[PDB]
Design a protein around this ligand. Structure first.
Ligand SMILES: Cc1cc2nc3c(=O)[nH]c(=O)nc-3n(C[C@H](O)[C@H](O)[C@H](O)COP(=O)(O)OP(=O)(O)OC[C@H]3O[C@@H](n4cnc5c(N)ncnc54)[C@H](O)[C@@H]3O)c2cc1C
Ligand SMILES: Nc1ncnc2c1ncn2[C@@H]1O[C@H](COP(=O)(O)O)[C@@H](O)[C@H]1O
Lengths: 535, 524
C-alpha cells in the first residue's frame, strides 16, 4: 500500500524536440519552449527557405504581451521596436450593414450615421453588478436613446475617430489595446532570440520524408540535402499542408467550411502617407461583395488583404475588387494569394506529433485569432509537456484545451456573419444559411433574453481566458453593431431606479473621458515616431 | 408595466430572511416583499459553518460590515475543515489515531491560496518530492502556513484586525436569522407575517396566485420563493416538481445534534470546523465563544437513531438522557428544476447535501444572487428560468461530487458504512478530475466580481489536493514538465521555506482565536 519512489535516474525525458517550420508558429514555438525547458532539451528548427511562409498575420489580440512576450522576458517596447509595431484599439467594421461594392469609405445608414461600428478592447464598467451594455440596450429598446453602442459605451470610440494613440507621450496607458506588426520582422526577431539566447539549432533544408518506428511514432525527418534529424517529440509548424499531423500521422482535419464560408485571400502591403492622413490605431474590416478586406496600419505602410470565398468570387474578381479599393495597378502590384482551410484537426496532438499554428486549427483572420492560437497552444504544450511515456491523459487534456479554445473563437466568428443584414450578393445570402454550432445558438438565446454573454473576470486568469476569451462586451459590439438586439431589456433593470441613475453617470463619464483624451492624447502618428525614433 | 409587484417568501430561517434581505436591497423598494413564517418559537443554538465568499457575495451586497453581523450571532473564524480519523478504523474519538508512519490521522482543508513558481502551483512541487522519496511531509503541512496557525489555535487576523490568512465563519444560525429579519423589516420594508400557510392557490396554468393563511389573510403575489425547508410546500407539494434523490452519490441522510458548553479558558478556541469520523458517518465540531455546535451525521441504513445518538453522546462523554438533542432526517439531492413557473425554491426546499464542507448557506446566497441576476417580469421568460436552473444544477452537482470524493477515497473498510461508500458509482465529473489529478496535472486552477463565476467551479486545485492527498490518493507520477525545470524546482524550494517561516512568524505574533473573539465580541 506504501508509496514506491521511482528508480534513481534512468532519464525518461524528451531529449530533442524537432520543430518543422520557420514561420511565426515555428519561431514562436522555438523561443517559448527554449525558455520553458531551461536548456534541458535540444531544440532544432527545420525550415525550407525554398518554401515561403504564408507572409500574413499582422494583427493581434490584447493578451499577446501577458501570455507570450512576458514569458520570454521581453518588454513590450523592445519587441515593438524590432517589428515596426503599431497599436490596435479595435477592429472597425465598415459597410457590413449596407449593400454594394467594396469601398474604404463608409456608406450612409438609413439613420444618417456612417456604416461603421467598432469592436474595442476596453473593459465595460458596471453599475449594481450589471455591465454598461445592458443599460444602453434598455435605453435603446425603451426608445430613450438613438445612440450607437460603441459611441455610448467606450471612450475608445472617440479616441479612434480622432486617430489618437492608446498611450500618452510619457507612455501612461489611456486604454486597452493590442498590436499591429510586421509578420516577417516578428519572425526574424524571434528567430534571432531563439538562436542567440535559447540555444536553438536552425537547419535550413526541406523535409522530404517523415521516418517512423514500428509503433508509428516519428523518429526523424529526412531532408532533401540528405540529413536525418532525429528527435523524440515533433512540433508540426509546417502550415496548412500539415506535413506531420495530417499527412504522416494521418490525423483527419475537420473541415468546417459549413460554419464559415471564406477560404481565400489576396494580400499586399500599401505604402501610406502618414503625414497627410495620420495612422489609424485600429484594424479595419471593410465589407466586400464576396467577403471582406483588412487594413492593418503601421508607420510608412498598411497591410491589406481581401478575404473571400472562392465559391463566390474567382481570384481575378477578388484581386480586381481588392485593387480598386486602394487604386493599385493589378498588373504591377506584388500580390500574395493564399488558400486557407477552416476547422481543426480531430486531435491537435497524436503520438509524438503536436500541431501548432496553421498546421492545427484556423478560422478566417477577422478577429486576429491565428497568433493567439499559436501562443495559447504553446502555453498548453509546456503545461502538458510529456516525457517518453507519452501519458495519454496529458495528450487528451492538451487536445481538449485546443478544442475548447477553437470552439470559443469559432462561435464569436459565426456571430459576425449569421447576423449580417446584407442580402445583396450570393455570399451575403449564403451566410444566413450557415450551420450554426449549438453553443453559439445557446449564446444568442441568452443574449436575446437580455442576459450577459460570458461576463469578464494571474496565469490562472489569462489561461482560463483561452476557454472563454470573447466576453459580454465583445458580443455586444458585434451583435449590436450588426443590428441584433435583445428581444427586451434585462428585466432586473426595471426594478432598479438607483442603478439606472448610476449608469447615467457612467454614460456621462464616457463622454467626458472621450472629450478629455481626444484633446490631450498624442496622435497615433506622433506616438509611433517617438517609440520607433523616426524623429 | 408588466413588472413583478409582490414577492411572497414562504418560510423564515436563514433561507427566508437571507432572501428577504437581499431582494429588499436588490429591488430598491419597487416591489412589496412579504415573508410568511409560522410562529414556531423554540429556536435553539445551532452552530453552522460557511465558506469564504459569504462576506463578498452576501453581506457586502447588503452593505453590512463583517464585524457588525458577526457580533450579532456569536460568530467565530473557520480557517479550514479538519478531518480527524477518516483513514483509520474504530469508534469515534475527538483524539486522532496514529498512522503507520506515526503522524496523527488528521488532514486539513484550508482556504489559503497556493503560491506558484513558473505557472505551476506549490501542490505539484510537493507531489513531485513526495512521489520521488524526497519529502515525508504531508501536503497540508508543506503547502499552507494556515496549518501551523490552526495547530496553535491562533487567529486568522491580528488584534489590529488586519488579515493574516483567508477564512470563513462559524455562527449561530438562529441569531443570524434574527439579525437579518430585523435588517429586512426595519431597513428594507419587508413585511413579516407571523402565521401558518393553509392553502396554495394556483391557476389552470399551474402558476401560484396567493397563499392563504390560518388567520384568514390571503397573500396575493406574482413571484413565490419557497423557503419552506425539506417539505418543499410550494415547489414539491403544490407545483408537483419531482425531487431527485441522490442517495446513490452520498449515503448519509440523518443527523443528531446538540450544543456543548466549552471551557475556552482551559482549551482555547479552534479556528476551524472539525469533521470527526464515526462508525456510520461523521461528527461536526463548530466552535464559538463558550460552546461548540456538534452533530453526528449518519446513514440510518447503517445506524438507528438510538445507536447514532449513543455514539454521538459517547464521543463527547455526554449523558444521553440529560442532553438536549435535535434529530433531523435529511433529503439528499435536488429538485429536477429549482425554479418552475413563478415558484423559485431556495435552501432545503431546493437542494441539500450533508454539511461536510459547509455548503448550506453557500447554496442559499448563490441561488439568491442568481435569482436577482435572472429576476423576471410577469411574462416569466422561460430563458431566464432555464439559465437560473442551469446555474443551480451545476453548482449543486459540483459540490455533491466534491463531497463524494471525501468518502469514495477513504481507505476505511472497518464498518458496513465505510465499505458501502466504495460500492457507489463514482460521479463522471470526479472520475474525470481524478484522472487529471493522477496524471500530475492541476484540477481547476484558481482564477485570482465574477465571484459569480466562482459558483460554477468553486472547488479549485488546492481543495482537490487537500482531500485526495489528505486521504492518501496521490498522483501516479509527478507532473512531467517539472523534470525539465531545475530553476523552477529551486524556486519552489524557496516557497516551501517561505511557508515554514510564515508559519513560525505568524504563530509567534498572532493572537489566540480565543483572545481575538473576546476582543471582537467585547467580553468583560
Ligand atoms: C490570409 C490570412 C490572414 C491572416 N491574418 C492574421 C492576423 O491578422 N492575425 C493573426 O493573429 N493571425 C492571422 N492569420 C493566421 C496567421 O498567419 C498564422 O497563424 C501565422 O502566420 C503562422 O503561420 P505558420 O507559421 O503556421 O505557417 P506558415 O507561415 O505557412 O509557415 C510554414 C513553415 O513551414 C515550412 N515548411 C513547409 N514544408 C516544409 C518542408 N517540407 N521542409 C521544411 N520546412 C517546411 C515553411 O517553409 C514555413 O517555414 C492569417 C492567416 C491567413 C491565411
Ligand atoms: N405551513 C407553513 N406556513 C408558514 N411557514 C412555514 C410552513 N411550513 C414551514 N414553514 C416555515 O418554513 C421555514 C423553514 O422550515 P424548516 O426548515 O422546516 O424549519 C420555517 O420558517 C417554517 O416556520
Amino acid at each position: 500500500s506504501g508509496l514506491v519512489p521511482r528508480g534513481s535516474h534512468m532519464d525518461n525525458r524528451i531529449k530533442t524536440v524537432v520543430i518543422l517550420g520557420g514561420g511565426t508558429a515555428g519561431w514562436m514555438t522555438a523561443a517559448y519552449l527554449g525558455k520553458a525547458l531551461q536548456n534541458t532539451v535540444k531544440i532544432v528548427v527545420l525550415e525550407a527557405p525554398t518554401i515561403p511562409r504564408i507572409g500574413v498575420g499582422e494583427a493581434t489580440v490584447p493578451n499577446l504581451q501577458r501570455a507570450f512576450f512576458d514569458y520570454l522576458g521581453i518588454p513590450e517596447e523592445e519587441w515593438m521596436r524590432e517589428c515596426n509595431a503599431s497599436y490596435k484599439m479595435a477592429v472597425k467594421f465598415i459597410n457590413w450593414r449596407t449593400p454594394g461594392e467594396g469601398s474604404p469609405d463608409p456608406r450612409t445608414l438609413d439613420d444618417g450615421h456612417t456604416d461603421t461600428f467598432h469592436h474595442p478592447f476596453g473593459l465595460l464598467p458596471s453599475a449594481d453588478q450589471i455591465p454598461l451594455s445592458h443599460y444602453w440596450a434598455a435605453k435603446r429598446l425603451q426608445g430613450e436613446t438613438d445612440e450607437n453602442f460603441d459611441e455610448a459605451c467606450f471612450a475608445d470610440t472617440a479616441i479612434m475617430n480622432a486617430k489618437k494613440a492608446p498611450r500618452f507621450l510619457d507612455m501612461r496607458r489611456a486604454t486597452n489595446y493590442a498590436w499591429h506588426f510586421d509578420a516577417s520582422k516578428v519572425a526574424a526577431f524571434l528567430r534571432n532570440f531563439a538562436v542567440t539566447k535559447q540555444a536553438v539549432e536552425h537547419v535550413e533544408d526541406e523535409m522530404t520524408e517523415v521516418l517512423t518506428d514500428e509503433r508509428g511514432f516519428i523518429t526523424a525527418l529526412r531532408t532533401k540535402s540528405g540529413r536525418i534529424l532525429q528527435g523524440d517529440l515533433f512540433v508540426d509548424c509546417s502550415g496548412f499542408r500539415g506535413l506531420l499531423i495530417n499527412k504522416a500521422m494521418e490525423e483527419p482535419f475537420i473541415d468546417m467550411s459549413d460554419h464559415l464560408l471564406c477560404n481565400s485571400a489576396v494580400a499586399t502591403a500599401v505604402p501610406h502617407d502618414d503625414e497627410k492622413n495620420g495612422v489609424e490605431p485600429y484594424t479595419s474590416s471593410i465589407a466586400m461583395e464576396a467577403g471582406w478586406t483588412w487594413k492593418i496600419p503601421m508607420l510608412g505602410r498598411f497591410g491589406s488583404g481581401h478575404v473571400y470565398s472562392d465559391h463566390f468570387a474567382t481570384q481575378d474578381e477578388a484581386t480586381l475588387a481588392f485593387s480598386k479599393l486602394w487604386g493599385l495597378d493589378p498588373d504591377n502590384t506584388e500580390f500574395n494569394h493564399v488558400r486557407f482551410r477552416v476547422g481543426r484537426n480531430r486531435r491537435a496532438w497524436v503520438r509524438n506529433c503536436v500541431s501548432v499554428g496553421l498546421a492545427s486549427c484556423f478560422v478566417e483572420p477577422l478577429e486576429s485569432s491565428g497568433i493567439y492560437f499559436i501562443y495559447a497552444a504553446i502555453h498548453m504544450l509546456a503545461k502538458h509537456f510529456p516525457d517518453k511515456t507519452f501519458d495519454k491523459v496529458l495528450v487528451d487534456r492538451f487536445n481538449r484545451e485546443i478544442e475548447e479554445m477553437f470552439d470559443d473563437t469559432r462561435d464569436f466568428l459565426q456571430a459576425h456573419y449569421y447576423f449580417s443584414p446584407r442580402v445583396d450578393t450570393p455570399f451575403w445570402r449564403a451566410n444566413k444559411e450557415l450551420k450554426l454550432a449549438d453553443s453559439i445558438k445557446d449564446k444568442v438565446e441568452t443574449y436575446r433574453a437580455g442576459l450577459p454573454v460570458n461576463l469578464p473576470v494571474y496565469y490562472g486568469n489569462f489561461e482560463a481566458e483561452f476557454r472563454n476569451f470573447w466576453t459580454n462586451g465583445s458580443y455586444y459590439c458585434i451583435f449590436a453593431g450588426l443590428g441584433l438586439m435583445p428581444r427586451n431589456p434585462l428585466p432586473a433593470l426595471a426594478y432598479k431606479p438607483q442603478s439606472i441613475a448610476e449608469a447615467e453617470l457612467l454614460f456621462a463619464d464616457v463622454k467626458r473621458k472621450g472629450d478629455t483624451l481626444v484633446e490631450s492624447l498624442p496622435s497615433t502618428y506622433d506616438l509611433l515616431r517617438q517609440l520607433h525614433g523616426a524623429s
